[PDB]
Amino acid sequence: SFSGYLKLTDNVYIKNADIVEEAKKVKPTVVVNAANVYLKHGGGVAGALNKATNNAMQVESDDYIATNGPLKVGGSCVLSGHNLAKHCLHVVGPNVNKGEDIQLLKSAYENFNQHEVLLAPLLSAGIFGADPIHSLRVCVDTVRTNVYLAVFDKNLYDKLVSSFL
Ligand SMILES: COc1ccc(C)cc1NC(=O)Nn1cnnc1
């Protein structure tokens, strides 16, 4: 199971970890991807998860988009977890750098409630441009299922824990 996490609340845990390494170690039922509406896994968490699957995530994602069209910002889809997890829940948080509504971050986190336990990154953090302290707050106030957050950056992890109310 999950090890080395700091408990923030009844259901939210956090660790300074590379989510790819964490997924390969735990092989959780669900790993969350910080997806975009096109499921183009170029960079950030998505680029790293996809690279760990040897591009199989991108091949599966392109077939999903060809059939279904793009996701909505705030939406998600369940696809294979490949070698990382049983499933990957691709969740689209708003990208502040694309001028997307930050209010959609709560809708994005609501997708996590359909899964009992998830390994996840902070939505809309990193290259998505939102404040990770705000993302953690929305996470704790929205997600009711068990979420194990992996924060890659040690300095950000320390800031998130030390400022957690
Ligand atoms: C790479 O991981 C999988 C791949 C395929 C499958 C069918 C399952 C997994 N996961 C897995 O077994 N996770 N788990 C969580 N709690 N007990 C077991």
mmCIF file with all atom_site columns, all heavy atoms in Angstrom, residues 26-29 81-86, ligand 1:
data_model
loop_
_atom_site.group_PDB
_atom_site.id
_atom_site.type_symbol
_atom_site.label_atom_id
_atom_site.label_alt_id
_atom_site.label_comp_id
_atom_site.label_asym_id
_atom_site.label_entity_id
_atom_site.label_seq_id
_atom_site.pdbx_PDB_ins_code
_atom_site.Cartn_x
_atom_site.Cartn_y
_atom_site.Cartn_z
_atom_site.occupancy
_atom_site.B_iso_or_equiv
_atom_site.pdbx_formal_charge
_atom_site.auth_seq_id
_atom_site.auth_comp_id
_atom_site.auth_asym_id
_atom_site.auth_atom_id
_atom_site.pdbx_PDB_model_num
ATOM   1  N N   . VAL A 1 26 ? 3.722   1.408  -6.147  1.00 0.00 ? 26 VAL A N   1
ATOM   2  C CA  . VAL A 1 26 ? 2.481   1.010  -5.516  1.00 0.00 ? 26 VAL A CA  1
ATOM   3  C C   . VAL A 1 26 ? 1.585   0.198  -6.427  1.00 0.00 ? 26 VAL A C   1
ATOM   4  O O   . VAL A 1 26 ? 0.880   -0.694 -5.973  1.00 0.00 ? 26 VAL A O   1
ATOM   5  C CB  . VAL A 1 26 ? 1.775   2.269  -4.946  1.00 0.00 ? 26 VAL A CB  1
ATOM   6  C CG1 . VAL A 1 26 ? 0.348   1.978  -4.506  1.00 0.00 ? 26 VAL A CG1 1
ATOM   7  C CG2 . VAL A 1 26 ? 2.597   2.871  -3.819  1.00 0.00 ? 26 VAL A CG2 1
ATOM   8  N N   . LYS A 1 27 ? 1.605   0.506  -7.736  1.00 0.00 ? 27 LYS A N   1
ATOM   9  C CA  . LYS A 1 27 ? 0.680   -0.049 -8.737  1.00 0.00 ? 27 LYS A CA  1
ATOM   10 C C   . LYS A 1 27 ? -0.774  0.143  -8.274  1.00 0.00 ? 27 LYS A C   1
ATOM   11 O O   . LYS A 1 27 ? -1.493  -0.831 -8.007  1.00 0.00 ? 27 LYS A O   1
ATOM   12 C CB  . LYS A 1 27 ? 1.057   -1.492 -9.082  1.00 0.00 ? 27 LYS A CB  1
ATOM   13 C CG  . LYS A 1 27 ? 2.416   -1.459 -9.772  1.00 0.00 ? 27 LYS A CG  1
ATOM   14 C CD  . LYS A 1 27 ? 3.209   -2.757 -9.748  1.00 0.00 ? 27 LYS A CD  1
ATOM   15 C CE  . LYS A 1 27 ? 4.114   -2.879 -10.968 1.00 0.00 ? 27 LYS A CE  1
ATOM   16 N NZ  . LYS A 1 27 ? 5.201   -3.898 -10.792 1.00 0.00 ? 27 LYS A NZ  1
ATOM   17 N N   . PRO A 1 28 ? -1.159  1.401  -7.987  1.00 0.00 ? 28 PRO A N   1
ATOM   18 C CA  . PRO A 1 28 ? -2.472  1.630  -7.386  1.00 0.00 ? 28 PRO A CA  1
ATOM   19 C C   . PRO A 1 28 ? -3.587  1.274  -8.333  1.00 0.00 ? 28 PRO A C   1
ATOM   20 O O   . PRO A 1 28 ? -3.365  1.121  -9.539  1.00 0.00 ? 28 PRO A O   1
ATOM   21 C CB  . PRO A 1 28 ? -2.455  3.135  -7.092  1.00 0.00 ? 28 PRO A CB  1
ATOM   22 C CG  . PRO A 1 28 ? -1.572  3.707  -8.190  1.00 0.00 ? 28 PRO A CG  1
ATOM   23 C CD  . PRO A 1 28 ? -0.462  2.673  -8.271  1.00 0.00 ? 28 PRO A CD  1
ATOM   24 N N   . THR A 1 29 ? -4.816  1.225  -7.810  1.00 0.00 ? 29 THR A N   1
ATOM   25 C CA  . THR A 1 29 ? -5.975  0.975  -8.662  1.00 0.00 ? 29 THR A CA  1
ATOM   26 C C   . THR A 1 29 ? -6.143  2.144  -9.630  1.00 0.00 ? 29 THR A C   1
ATOM   27 O O   . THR A 1 29 ? -6.446  1.918  -10.794 1.00 0.00 ? 29 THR A O   1
ATOM   28 C CB  . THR A 1 29 ? -7.237  0.825  -7.811  1.00 0.00 ? 29 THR A CB  1
ATOM   29 O OG1 . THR A 1 29 ? -7.020  -0.241 -6.885  1.00 0.00 ? 29 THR A OG1 1
ATOM   30 C CG2 . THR A 1 29 ? -8.468  0.506  -8.653  1.00 0.00 ? 29 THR A CG2 1
ATOM   31 N N   . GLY A 1 81 ? -4.378  2.139  -16.954 1.00 0.00 ? 81 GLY A N   1
ATOM   32 C CA  . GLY A 1 81 ? -3.221  2.627  -16.216 1.00 0.00 ? 81 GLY A CA  1
ATOM   33 C C   . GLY A 1 81 ? -1.926  2.055  -16.762 1.00 0.00 ? 81 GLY A C   1
ATOM   34 O O   . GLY A 1 81 ? -0.858  2.352  -16.241 1.00 0.00 ? 81 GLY A O   1
ATOM   35 N N   . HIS A 1 82 ? -2.005  1.163  -17.782 1.00 0.00 ? 82 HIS A N   1
ATOM   36 C CA  . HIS A 1 82 ? -0.815  0.582  -18.413 1.00 0.00 ? 82 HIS A CA  1
ATOM   37 C C   . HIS A 1 82 ? 0.052   -0.110 -17.355 1.00 0.00 ? 82 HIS A C   1
ATOM   38 O O   . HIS A 1 82 ? -0.488  -0.861 -16.544 1.00 0.00 ? 82 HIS A O   1
ATOM   39 C CB  . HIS A 1 82 ? -0.094  1.671  -19.251 1.00 0.00 ? 82 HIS A CB  1
ATOM   40 C CG  . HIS A 1 82 ? -0.984  2.199  -20.304 1.00 0.00 ? 82 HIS A CG  1
ATOM   41 N ND1 . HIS A 1 82 ? -1.111  1.546  -21.514 1.00 0.00 ? 82 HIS A ND1 1
ATOM   42 C CD2 . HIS A 1 82 ? -1.845  3.240  -20.268 1.00 0.00 ? 82 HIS A CD2 1
ATOM   43 C CE1 . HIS A 1 82 ? -2.052  2.197  -22.172 1.00 0.00 ? 82 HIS A CE1 1
ATOM   44 N NE2 . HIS A 1 82 ? -2.524  3.225  -21.470 1.00 0.00 ? 82 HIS A NE2 1
ATOM   45 N N   . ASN A 1 83 ? 1.349   0.174  -17.336 1.00 0.00 ? 83 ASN A N   1
ATOM   46 C CA  . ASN A 1 83 ? 2.271   -0.394 -16.360 1.00 0.00 ? 83 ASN A CA  1
ATOM   47 C C   . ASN A 1 83 ? 2.316   0.378  -15.035 1.00 0.00 ? 83 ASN A C   1
ATOM   48 O O   . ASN A 1 83 ? 3.106   0.022  -14.144 1.00 0.00 ? 83 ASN A O   1
ATOM   49 C CB  . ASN A 1 83 ? 3.690   -0.401 -16.957 1.00 0.00 ? 83 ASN A CB  1
ATOM   50 C CG  . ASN A 1 83 ? 4.167   0.969  -17.434 1.00 0.00 ? 83 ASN A CG  1
ATOM   51 O OD1 . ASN A 1 83 ? 3.404   1.725  -18.057 1.00 0.00 ? 83 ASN A OD1 1
ATOM   52 N ND2 . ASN A 1 83 ? 5.439   1.310  -17.193 1.00 0.00 ? 83 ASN A ND2 1
ATOM   53 N N   . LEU A 1 84 ? 1.508   1.437  -14.906 1.00 0.00 ? 84 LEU A N   1
ATOM   54 C CA  . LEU A 1 84 ? 1.552   2.300  -13.735 1.00 0.00 ? 84 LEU A CA  1
ATOM   55 C C   . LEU A 1 84 ? 0.481   2.048  -12.702 1.00 0.00 ? 84 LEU A C   1
ATOM   56 O O   . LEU A 1 84 ? 0.685   2.317  -11.514 1.00 0.00 ? 84 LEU A O   1
ATOM   57 C CB  . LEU A 1 84 ? 1.436   3.751  -14.214 1.00 0.00 ? 84 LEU A CB  1
ATOM   58 C CG  . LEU A 1 84 ? 2.522   4.199  -15.198 1.00 0.00 ? 84 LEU A CG  1
ATOM   59 C CD1 . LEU A 1 84 ? 2.260   5.602  -15.678 1.00 0.00 ? 84 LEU A CD1 1
ATOM   60 C CD2 . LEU A 1 84 ? 3.937   4.078  -14.577 1.00 0.00 ? 84 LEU A CD2 1
ATOM   61 N N   . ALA A 1 85 ? -0.672  1.593  -13.141 1.00 0.00 ? 85 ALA A N   1
ATOM   62 C CA  . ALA A 1 85 ? -1.838  1.462  -12.284 1.00 0.00 ? 85 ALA A CA  1
ATOM   63 C C   . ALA A 1 85 ? -2.865  0.584  -13.006 1.00 0.00 ? 85 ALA A C   1
ATOM   64 O O   . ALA A 1 85 ? -2.691  0.315  -14.203 1.00 0.00 ? 85 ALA A O   1
ATOM   65 C CB  . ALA A 1 85 ? -2.447  2.863  -12.069 1.00 0.00 ? 85 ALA A CB  1
ATOM   66 N N   . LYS A 1 86 ? -3.974  0.171  -12.326 1.00 0.00 ? 86 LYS A N   1
ATOM   67 C CA  . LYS A 1 86 ? -5.018  -0.545 -13.028 1.00 0.00 ? 86 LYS A CA  1
ATOM   68 C C   . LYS A 1 86 ? -5.677  0.431  -14.050 1.00 0.00 ? 86 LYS A C   1
ATOM   69 O O   . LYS A 1 86 ? -5.769  0.130  -15.258 1.00 0.00 ? 86 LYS A O   1
ATOM   70 C CB  . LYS A 1 86 ? -6.058  -1.055 -12.029 1.00 0.00 ? 86 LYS A CB  1
ATOM   71 C CG  . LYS A 1 86 ? -7.179  -1.782 -12.755 1.00 0.00 ? 86 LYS A CG  1
ATOM   72 C CD  . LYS A 1 86 ? -8.055  -2.528 -11.779 1.00 0.00 ? 86 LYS A CD  1
ATOM   73 C CE  . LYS A 1 86 ? -9.148  -3.309 -12.494 1.00 0.00 ? 86 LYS A CE  1
ATOM   74 N NZ  . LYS A 1 86 ? -10.146 -3.871 -11.526 1.00 0.00 ? 86 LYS A NZ  1
HETATM 75 C C1  . LIG B 2 .  ? -0.193  -1.934 -12.490 1.00 0.00 ? 1  LIG B C1  1
HETATM 76 O O1  . LIG B 2 .  ? -1.300  -2.194 -11.622 1.00 0.00 ? 1  LIG B O1  1
HETATM 77 C C2  . LIG B 2 .  ? -2.347  -2.922 -12.120 1.00 0.00 ? 1  LIG B C2  1
HETATM 78 C C3  . LIG B 2 .  ? -2.453  -3.365 -13.431 1.00 0.00 ? 1  LIG B C3  1
HETATM 79 C C4  . LIG B 2 .  ? -3.507  -4.188 -13.786 1.00 0.00 ? 1  LIG B C4  1
HETATM 80 C C5  . LIG B 2 .  ? -4.462  -4.593 -12.858 1.00 0.00 ? 1  LIG B C5  1
HETATM 81 C C6  . LIG B 2 .  ? -5.567  -5.543 -13.249 1.00 0.00 ? 1  LIG B C6  1
HETATM 82 C C7  . LIG B 2 .  ? -4.361  -4.123 -11.554 1.00 0.00 ? 1  LIG B C7  1
HETATM 83 C C8  . LIG B 2 .  ? -3.323  -3.276 -11.174 1.00 0.00 ? 1  LIG B C8  1
HETATM 84 N N1  . LIG B 2 .  ? -3.260  -2.682 -9.886  1.00 0.00 ? 1  LIG B N1  1
HETATM 85 C C9  . LIG B 2 .  ? -3.435  -3.354 -8.699  1.00 0.00 ? 1  LIG B C9  1
HETATM 86 O O2  . LIG B 2 .  ? -3.374  -4.578 -8.594  1.00 0.00 ? 1  LIG B O2  1
HETATM 87 N N2  . LIG B 2 .  ? -3.744  -2.529 -7.667  1.00 0.00 ? 1  LIG B N2  1
HETATM 88 N N3  . LIG B 2 .  ? -4.101  -2.879 -6.340  1.00 0.00 ? 1  LIG B N3  1
HETATM 89 C C10 . LIG B 2 .  ? -4.509  -1.986 -5.405  1.00 0.00 ? 1  LIG B C10 1
HETATM 90 N N4  . LIG B 2 .  ? -4.776  -2.599 -4.285  1.00 0.00 ? 1  LIG B N4  1
HETATM 91 N N5  . LIG B 2 .  ? -4.538  -3.954 -4.493  1.00 0.00 ? 1  LIG B N5  1
HETATM 92 C C11 . LIG B 2 .  ? -4.137  -4.089 -5.727  1.00 0.00 ? 1  LIG B C11 1
#
